[PDB]
Structure formats: structure tokens, C-alpha cells
């Protein structure tokens, strides 16, 4: 729609599981 939650929820993806 906008992108930038289309790379936010991929980033807040990622750095939601580096540990662990």
C-alpha cells in the first residue's frame, strides 16, 4: 500500500528473534 511497514514487519521480524 504504502512500503514501509512491508520492510517494518520484516525488520520488527528479524529483530524479534535474533536471540532465541
Do not use: S
Request: no cysteine; aromatic share 16%; charged share 15%.
Amino acid at each position: 500500500v504504502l512500503f514501509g511497514a512491508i520492510a517494518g514487519f520484516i525488520e520488527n521480524g528479524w529483530e524479534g528473534m535474533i536471540d532465541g
